[PDB]
Amino acid sequence: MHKMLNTDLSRILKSPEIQRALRAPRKKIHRRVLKKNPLKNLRIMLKLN
Amino acid sequence: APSRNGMILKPHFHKDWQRRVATWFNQPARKIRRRKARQARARRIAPRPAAGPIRPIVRCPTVRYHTKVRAGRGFSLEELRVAGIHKKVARTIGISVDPRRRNKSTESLQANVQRLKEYRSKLVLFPRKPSAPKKGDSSAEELKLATQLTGPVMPIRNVFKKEKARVITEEEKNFKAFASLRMARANARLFGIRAKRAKEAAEQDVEKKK
Amino acid sequence: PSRLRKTRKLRGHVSHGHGRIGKHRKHPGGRGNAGGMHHHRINFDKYHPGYFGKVGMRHYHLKRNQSFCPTVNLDKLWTLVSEQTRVNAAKNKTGAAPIIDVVRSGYYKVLGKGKLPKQPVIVKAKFFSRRAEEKIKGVGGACVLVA
Amino acid sequence: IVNFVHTNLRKNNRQPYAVSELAGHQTSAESWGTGRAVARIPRVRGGGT
RNA sequence: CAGUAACGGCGAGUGAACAGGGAAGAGCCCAGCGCCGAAUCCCCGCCCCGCGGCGGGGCGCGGGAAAUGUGGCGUACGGAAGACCCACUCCCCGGCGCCGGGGGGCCCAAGUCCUUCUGAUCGAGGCCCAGCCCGUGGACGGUGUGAGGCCGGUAGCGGCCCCCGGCGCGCCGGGCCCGGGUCUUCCCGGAGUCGGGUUGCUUGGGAAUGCAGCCCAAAGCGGGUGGUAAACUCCAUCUAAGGCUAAAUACCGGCACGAGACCGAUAGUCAACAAGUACCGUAAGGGAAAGUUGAAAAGAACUUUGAAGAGAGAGUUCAAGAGGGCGUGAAACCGUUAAGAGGUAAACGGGUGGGGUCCGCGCAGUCCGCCCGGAGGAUUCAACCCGGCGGCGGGUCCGGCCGUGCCGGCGGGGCGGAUCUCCCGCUCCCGUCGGCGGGGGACCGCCCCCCGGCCGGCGACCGGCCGCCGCCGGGCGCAUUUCCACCGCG
RNA sequence: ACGCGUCCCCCGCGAGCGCACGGGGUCGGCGGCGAUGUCGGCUACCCACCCGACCCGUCUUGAAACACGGACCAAGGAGUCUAACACGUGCGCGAGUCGGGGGCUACGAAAGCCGCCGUGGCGCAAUGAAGGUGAAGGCCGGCGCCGCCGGCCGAGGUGGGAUCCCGAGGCCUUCCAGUCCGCCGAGGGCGCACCACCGGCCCGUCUCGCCCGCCGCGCCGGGGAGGUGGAGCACGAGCGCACGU
RNA sequence: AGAGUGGCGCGGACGCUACGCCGCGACGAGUAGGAGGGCCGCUGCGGUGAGCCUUGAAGCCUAGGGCGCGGGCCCGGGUGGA
RNA sequence: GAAAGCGGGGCCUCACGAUCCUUCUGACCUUUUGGGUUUUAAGCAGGAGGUGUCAGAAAAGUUACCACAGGGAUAACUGGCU
């Protein structure tokens, strides 16, 4: 006698109830920094202050 | 060297056990023999049951198994004689014989006089020659219809008589269950001490008079 | 299996998990339970208090069927019937009571544990402990004995 | 529950095998001892073969 | 049942039984008390049969055993005699014909068809529209590789011909004079043994579980047992001091057989081979090493150097780069050719340079779209009708099929429950009130099948008529459309 | 500091182009040398030079050691089966579970089946050397105290405890009401496991006191308050299989 | 990035063995001894590969060419003969 | 001692001893194997008999006739530090 009744989780994920109770996605990536020394570099230095 | 917490334990391998080890690799075509030479048995004894001479109604002893019933060794010599079958004729028609058994109650004695009529009736008995029967020998229609039996003959199953749902009377409810178990324990043990002092107190009244 | 065990991860290492200094050598403490009042003292007396000594009387040819006493509590004393002696008994007007025999379900002495489901009950039992009497009587039921 | 079973089931129609106990210990042998400059293993007792 | 109850410098350590449930199952004979004229046995001389288990019958003024006890009835479940009842024809010892397993041998389907690689094929490709042929035979082995159909078998309640039983059923021949229920009167059993005291071994048995010696040594309402010594006691349960008996169990020796998730010639038995053999020890005893040419011997005629082994050429083989201890043929260690180098023993790590060897298949240098100009090919693109198929919903077409969905039915059932009792078995009572059983009949649950009434599904589960838009074939369409291939430092 | 319409002390969508010290590099820049003698090739074979580098195993506070085994090469060569135990981890079923002996009927000596084959094992009950005993209570009536009569709820606290539940108030496109559907939320509620503390109930033992129950009226049986011994209760987690230490 | 009641051209890269991909920081000695992972090896048994082999299997040899930190493995050549 | 009090050994820091078996003391006590009356054994608690190698075996020598496993963790020489 079955543990879970609908194994079909391609289709359970996209029926009216599950897609009206989850926050929106974040599909953007944020790649790493190279710290331009603001004692040297101008507009880098005009951004701080 | 025991490490730490851990149960102490005594092995008996101090002898030379290996020289006496038993294994059962035989186990499968040792069964398949029994069953074969089992299967030989009753082709030899054709319309006689392979279930053999019939076993009596017998209890199991002691206070544990004394609620139970089982098959026994043989019918007592006051169960055969009352029914109307002799001890050396009973062997010659599937009825068990044992020279030792007892009759102490009449509640397991009436159960073994009726057992032998059930049987005597439902038996089918063949003629000495096929071409000339006699008097007690059965007809040639049963004997046509008659045939072998399989498994114990009239096998004893576990029995108990039922009881109803009853309105309790006003003196059942006025009966102690624990205090009547304790005043039967008290008077069984102390009756030896009781009777010698009802004697020694009644001994002194006889002496001071005379 | 002989592959998933420790001894494959050790073909290559020298001391094989029994030592550089003090090796695997035959029997360091004495075989079996040795040293019971000497050099394996502490242990014995700190996870097996009471191994060493006598107590009580000795009964010789002890036959254990005479000592034979099974047991059945209250909470679950209705566990010897079908689900038919209780639902029709609760339906009654004149006030009947079914007969639970305990000798029929391998029970000799009747014990006094939990609650009771409160509806009339006659109770056969070989031994009544003192709470099996007072729980069944206060609700309302007889206490018949058997041998 | 097919696999677990299928391993533990396929063992029981198997035959015994064994290597003998006579063999190896079917000589009268004995160690020569320290001295002679040999390894200390037991060696075989008396001959010219 | 239990690693228990019991032992144990109560330390290490050892260690049952009975009950419960199974396999196997089968039960009996004398000594003694006494009845029947020893009624009993052994050996020998002679004929008829007859047998390679000397047994069958007749005939002996033939010997012997035996009253210091042979045979018949008979032994504790009691046994016997006599009297009065009930019944009385089946029970064994051998031959003659009649009715179907255990051992030997002799026999039973189908390709060596058509091409093709080989030294040789058992290999590769085909054999239609009966998917070459047989398949109760596609286990195994052999045959110049690797075969269901080339040769042996394999299969099947298959075929024949010989040897020896086993049950059933007649015809002569032999025995055997036999069985149960009530009444009276008789009558009954193992001795230097049971039993103790002591001494030593034994056991889980503790003021001694079993065995033996030496001493003492019985009883007949008597004697053993009843797990702590004894006296005084009622109960409970067996008859000891003579004897036989099949099965269920065990089987590293013997005679045959069948297998293997084993080992593969320093393995596996000491032994794959002239092994318990060569050889060692006075003797008891100790005891190895050692498998392989090739498909076939086709095992190298003749010549030539040599006294001879060793050689040079001929030759067989697919090969001698397989040449009689001859499959493949590794390392250590040698010998000779090429290169390279060389006074701090050699060898090693990092880093570069020089020279070799091979290898790149290197020596005029990358493709992939769309776009534009200038030279052509091929009957060709949109659109419209003609058939076949999918993808889908017709937000409201018609049925049928499911359900870890229910609500009915005065519907035609299968097992379950420690729920209630009319017909009859058996049994104490005198056609009769009561008591324990062998089935039917109501009632409650658990489900199979059939008709109506609500819910859900066709995404582990459909069929038709519509409406759409998608491909793919056919017609028509005759080019400033559709694509093909090429050429321009575009 | 730079339109204007009103509040004041104090006198809510303009239009485009463009350059860059701006969330890690690209030329919308160039030149030689190419067929039998040259291109390339880190890798693997020989030589040469600069720097570094004592022989391995080993016991040992210490080994390059004047501590021991090692002349070279092949082939063999050492934590293993089975009987207990325990803790962890996978899996079936769950107050249960398990046929392991016994049965029935080529691969198979396998594999499906018994249930009135669960006898039996371990588990659901402790505690005493034993005889033996053997597991909640409250709150209102019939006579300010007993001995008995009815009716109701019930496995008892306090403190900390993953999450749920009630929702003062708000979540914008001209304004003024009005909602449904969701989410954000002051503080305030039922408290699952795991603990820390307080009360209680069953066996054993210790000290104090008065009444019960009776076919057998006792050297007979049963109740009550406070210490104390335990491998105990207190709405259960065990049993069979496999793996590892 | 809320939902209502009133005043010409049929076109737009990769992905996600979810036991996979991707994303931003801090650290990385080890003898006795623990633990994980091994698309590291060696021999046997069930499954699978419409696997491969006399047009040349296994083993060996190789100043031939490639693969991973590593254990080890892939391809050129010659032998060999199932 | 009048009374507050104080006393369960020496004013405080040492003067002492386990399993088993052997003794005595305690009660209208449990048991004595089928049931019962009397001798008799066995237990439950609390003291004593003692282990001084004092966490607690029951034990004398010799080897220049000698033996095995080991030690430079251990002496007889050199060298070293002093």
PDB file of C-alpha atoms (C1' of nucleotides) in Angstrom, chain E residues 94-232:
ATOM      1  C1'   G E  94       5.587 -78.067  -0.298  1.00  0.00           C
ATOM      2  C1'   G E  95       4.738 -79.197  -6.020  1.00  0.00           C
ATOM      3  C1'   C E  96       1.945 -78.904 -11.182  1.00  0.00           C
ATOM      4  C1'   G E  97      -0.240 -75.134 -14.816  1.00  0.00           C
ATOM      5  C1'   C E  98      -2.784 -70.512 -15.253  1.00  0.00           C
ATOM      6  C1'   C E  99      -2.267 -63.736 -14.593  1.00  0.00           C
ATOM      7  C1'   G E 100       2.077 -57.676 -16.218  1.00  0.00           C
ATOM      8  C1'   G E 101       9.418 -55.033 -11.542  1.00  0.00           C
ATOM      9  C1'   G E 102      15.639 -56.228 -11.286  1.00  0.00           C
ATOM     10  C1'   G E 103      19.971 -57.224 -14.846  1.00  0.00           C
ATOM     11  C1'   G E 104      22.421 -57.884 -19.725  1.00  0.00           C
ATOM     12  C1'   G E 105      22.851 -56.745 -24.825  1.00  0.00           C
ATOM     13  C1'   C E 106      21.064 -55.285 -30.369  1.00  0.00           C
ATOM     14  C1'   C E 107      18.421 -51.136 -32.784  1.00  0.00           C
ATOM     15  C1'   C E 108      15.366 -45.955 -34.052  1.00  0.00           C
ATOM     16  C1'   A E 109      14.915 -37.439 -37.403  1.00  0.00           C
ATOM     17  C1'   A E 110      17.162 -33.579 -39.909  1.00  0.00           C
ATOM     18  C1'   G E 111      22.275 -30.124 -45.121  1.00  0.00           C
ATOM     19  C1'   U E 112      28.264 -32.321 -45.455  1.00  0.00           C
ATOM     20  C1'   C E 113      22.761 -28.326 -51.102  1.00  0.00           C
ATOM     21  C1'   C E 114      24.640 -22.716 -53.725  1.00  0.00           C
ATOM     22  C1'   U E 115      28.561 -19.011 -53.895  1.00  0.00           C
ATOM     23  C1'   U E 116      32.965 -17.552 -50.673  1.00  0.00           C
ATOM     24  C1'   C E 117      37.979 -16.894 -46.916  1.00  0.00           C
ATOM     25  C1'   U E 118      41.755 -21.302 -45.256  1.00  0.00           C
ATOM     26  C1'   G E 119      47.142 -25.365 -45.080  1.00  0.00           C
ATOM     27  C1'   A E 120      42.580 -27.201 -43.751  1.00  0.00           C
ATOM     28  C1'   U E 121      36.856 -25.415 -42.055  1.00  0.00           C
ATOM     29  C1'   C E 122      32.902 -26.662 -37.591  1.00  0.00           C
ATOM     30  C1'   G E 123      33.695 -19.802 -40.367  1.00  0.00           C
ATOM     31  C1'   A E 124      31.091 -15.226 -43.784  1.00  0.00           C
ATOM     32  C1'   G E 125      26.626 -14.562 -47.307  1.00  0.00           C
ATOM     33  C1'   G E 126      22.109 -16.720 -49.314  1.00  0.00           C
ATOM     34  C1'   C E 127      18.030 -20.993 -49.713  1.00  0.00           C
ATOM     35  C1'   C E 128      10.638 -17.121 -52.184  1.00  0.00           C
ATOM     36  C1'   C E 129       4.495 -16.429 -51.240  1.00  0.00           C
ATOM     37  C1'   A E 130       5.424 -23.337 -45.740  1.00  0.00           C
ATOM     38  C1'   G E 131      10.293 -17.281 -43.752  1.00  0.00           C
ATOM     39  C1'   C E 132      16.338 -24.335 -46.321  1.00  0.00           C
ATOM     40  C1'   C E 133      15.319 -29.234 -42.804  1.00  0.00           C
ATOM     41  C1'   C E 134      14.245 -31.926 -37.936  1.00  0.00           C
ATOM     42  C1'   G E 135      12.797 -30.073 -33.346  1.00  0.00           C
ATOM     43  C1'   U E 136       9.118 -35.791 -27.142  1.00  0.00           C
ATOM     44  C1'   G E 137      16.144 -34.675 -29.995  1.00  0.00           C
ATOM     45  C1'   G E 138      19.240 -26.602 -29.617  1.00  0.00           C
ATOM     46  C1'   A E 139      22.974 -32.007 -22.963  1.00  0.00           C
ATOM     47  C1'   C E 140      27.797 -33.722 -23.769  1.00  0.00           C
ATOM     48  C1'   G E 141      32.157 -35.648 -26.856  1.00  0.00           C
ATOM     49  C1'   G E 142      34.641 -36.525 -31.374  1.00  0.00           C
ATOM     50  C1'   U E 143      35.979 -34.973 -36.446  1.00  0.00           C
ATOM     51  C1'   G E 144      43.184 -31.076 -40.349  1.00  0.00           C
ATOM     52  C1'   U E 145      39.377 -24.059 -36.281  1.00  0.00           C
ATOM     53  C1'   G E 146      34.542 -21.871 -33.595  1.00  0.00           C
ATOM     54  C1'   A E 147      28.681 -28.044 -35.745  1.00  0.00           C
ATOM     55  C1'   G E 148      20.883 -29.260 -33.412  1.00  0.00           C
ATOM     56  C1'   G E 149      20.839 -31.408 -39.445  1.00  0.00           C
ATOM     57  C1'   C E 150      29.202 -35.421 -40.989  1.00  0.00           C
ATOM     58  C1'   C E 151      30.130 -39.471 -36.824  1.00  0.00           C
ATOM     59  C1'   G E 152      28.407 -41.507 -31.297  1.00  0.00           C
ATOM     60  C1'   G E 153      24.484 -40.448 -28.294  1.00  0.00           C
ATOM     61  C1'   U E 154      20.314 -36.708 -26.545  1.00  0.00           C
ATOM     62  C1'   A E 155      14.331 -37.377 -26.641  1.00  0.00           C
ATOM     63  C1'   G E 156       9.775 -41.321 -25.623  1.00  0.00           C
ATOM     64  C1'   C E 157       4.060 -44.930 -20.813  1.00  0.00           C
ATOM     65  C1'   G E 158       9.721 -46.105 -27.863  1.00  0.00           C
ATOM     66  C1'   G E 159      10.957 -51.063 -30.693  1.00  0.00           C
ATOM     67  C1'   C E 160      12.744 -56.413 -30.268  1.00  0.00           C
ATOM     68  C1'   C E 161      15.127 -60.578 -28.283  1.00  0.00           C
ATOM     69  C1'   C E 162      17.262 -63.534 -23.156  1.00  0.00           C
ATOM     70  C1'   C E 163      17.880 -64.297 -17.750  1.00  0.00           C
ATOM     71  C1'   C E 164      15.423 -64.416 -12.559  1.00  0.00           C
ATOM     72  C1'   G E 165      11.932 -63.178  -9.158  1.00  0.00           C
ATOM     73  C1'   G E 166       6.733 -60.840  -7.073  1.00  0.00           C
ATOM     74  C1'   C E 167       1.936 -60.695  -6.044  1.00  0.00           C
ATOM     75  C1'   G E 168      -3.441 -63.805  -7.522  1.00  0.00           C
ATOM     76  C1'   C E 169      -6.284 -68.564  -8.963  1.00  0.00           C
ATOM     77  C1'   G E 170      -7.396 -73.639 -10.034  1.00  0.00           C
ATOM     78  C1'   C E 171      -5.582 -79.671  -9.272  1.00  0.00           C
ATOM     79  C1'   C E 172      -3.515 -83.162  -6.572  1.00  0.00           C
ATOM     80  C1'   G E 173      -0.329 -84.002  -1.932  1.00  0.00           C
ATOM     81  C1'   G E 174       0.745 -82.946   3.673  1.00  0.00           C
ATOM     82  C1'   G E 175      -0.645 -81.679   8.124  1.00  0.00           C
ATOM     83  C1'   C E 176      -4.914 -79.277  12.133  1.00  0.00           C
ATOM     84  C1'   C E 177      -9.920 -81.496  15.761  1.00  0.00           C
ATOM     85  C1'   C E 178      -9.325 -76.070  17.973  1.00  0.00           C
ATOM     86  C1'   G E 179     -14.216 -70.618  19.906  1.00  0.00           C
ATOM     87  C1'   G E 180     -16.560 -66.635  23.557  1.00  0.00           C
ATOM     88  C1'   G E 181     -20.119 -64.783  28.093  1.00  0.00           C
ATOM     89  C1'   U E 182     -22.424 -65.618  33.723  1.00  0.00           C
ATOM     90  C1'   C E 183     -22.038 -68.926  38.476  1.00  0.00           C
ATOM     91  C1'   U E 184     -19.036 -72.230  42.189  1.00  0.00           C
ATOM     92  C1'   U E 185     -14.029 -74.087  44.119  1.00  0.00           C
ATOM     93  C1'   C E 186      -8.940 -74.059  43.661  1.00  0.00           C
ATOM     94  C1'   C E 187      -3.785 -71.167  42.944  1.00  0.00           C
ATOM     95  C1'   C E 188       0.050 -67.765  42.165  1.00  0.00           C
ATOM     96  C1'   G E 189       6.237 -66.504  40.848  1.00  0.00           C
ATOM     97  C1'   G E 190      13.916 -65.647  40.363  1.00  0.00           C
ATOM     98  C1'   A E 191      19.329 -65.536  47.391  1.00  0.00           C
ATOM     99  C1'   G E 192      25.251 -64.476  48.941  1.00  0.00           C
ATOM    100  C1'   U E 193      20.696 -61.899  46.045  1.00  0.00           C
ATOM    101  C1'   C E 194      17.901 -57.125  47.964  1.00  0.00           C
ATOM    102  C1'   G E 195      19.804 -54.412  52.011  1.00  0.00           C
ATOM    103  C1'   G E 196      23.353 -51.904  54.817  1.00  0.00           C
ATOM    104  C1'   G E 197      29.321 -50.140  57.028  1.00  0.00           C
ATOM    105  C1'   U E 198      33.521 -48.883  55.012  1.00  0.00           C
ATOM    106  C1'   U E 199      37.386 -48.039  51.230  1.00  0.00           C
ATOM    107  C1'   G E 200      38.504 -46.094  45.820  1.00  0.00           C
ATOM    108  C1'   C E 201      36.653 -44.330  41.071  1.00  0.00           C
ATOM    109  C1'   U E 202      32.485 -41.824  38.691  1.00  0.00           C
ATOM    110  C1'   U E 203      28.002 -37.798  38.145  1.00  0.00           C
ATOM    111  C1'   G E 204      24.791 -31.603  37.361  1.00  0.00           C
ATOM    112  C1'   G E 205      22.649 -35.293  42.153  1.00  0.00           C
ATOM    113  C1'   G E 206      23.932 -31.451  47.324  1.00  0.00           C
ATOM    114  C1'   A E 207      24.585 -36.132  55.298  1.00  0.00           C
ATOM    115  C1'   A E 208      26.949 -39.773  48.872  1.00  0.00           C
ATOM    116  C1'   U E 209      23.669 -40.030  41.134  1.00  0.00           C
ATOM    117  C1'   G E 210      26.033 -44.978  39.240  1.00  0.00           C
ATOM    118  C1'   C E 211      29.937 -48.879  39.695  1.00  0.00           C
ATOM    119  C1'   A E 212      33.410 -52.304  42.252  1.00  0.00           C
ATOM    120  C1'   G E 213      36.146 -54.793  46.085  1.00  0.00           C
ATOM    121  C1'   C E 214      36.243 -56.650  51.637  1.00  0.00           C
ATOM    122  C1'   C E 215      33.105 -57.248  55.889  1.00  0.00           C
ATOM    123  C1'   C E 216      27.893 -57.850  57.705  1.00  0.00           C
ATOM    124  C1'   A E 217      23.806 -59.975  55.061  1.00  0.00           C
ATOM    125  C1'   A E 218      17.217 -60.061  54.827  1.00  0.00           C
ATOM    126  C1'   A E 219      11.673 -59.889  54.287  1.00  0.00           C
ATOM    127  C1'   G E 220       6.193 -62.106  52.541  1.00  0.00           C
ATOM    128  C1'   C E 221      -0.411 -56.862  54.913  1.00  0.00           C
ATOM    129  C1'   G E 222       6.318 -58.247  51.973  1.00  0.00           C
ATOM    130  C1'   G E 223       9.980 -55.328  48.837  1.00  0.00           C
ATOM    131  C1'   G E 224      11.872 -50.639  45.737  1.00  0.00           C
ATOM    132  C1'   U E 225      10.766 -45.388  44.593  1.00  0.00           C
ATOM    133  C1'   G E 226       8.861 -40.343  45.983  1.00  0.00           C
ATOM    134  C1'   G E 227      16.336 -35.213  44.592  1.00  0.00           C
ATOM    135  C1'   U E 228      18.438 -32.878  52.928  1.00  0.00           C
ATOM    136  C1'   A E 229      20.094 -36.973  57.833  1.00  0.00           C
ATOM    137  C1'   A E 230      16.247 -39.599  61.390  1.00  0.00           C
ATOM    138  C1'   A E 231      11.756 -41.261  64.695  1.00  0.00           C
ATOM    139  C1'   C E 232       6.978 -41.589  65.038  1.00  0.00           C
TER     140        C E 232
END
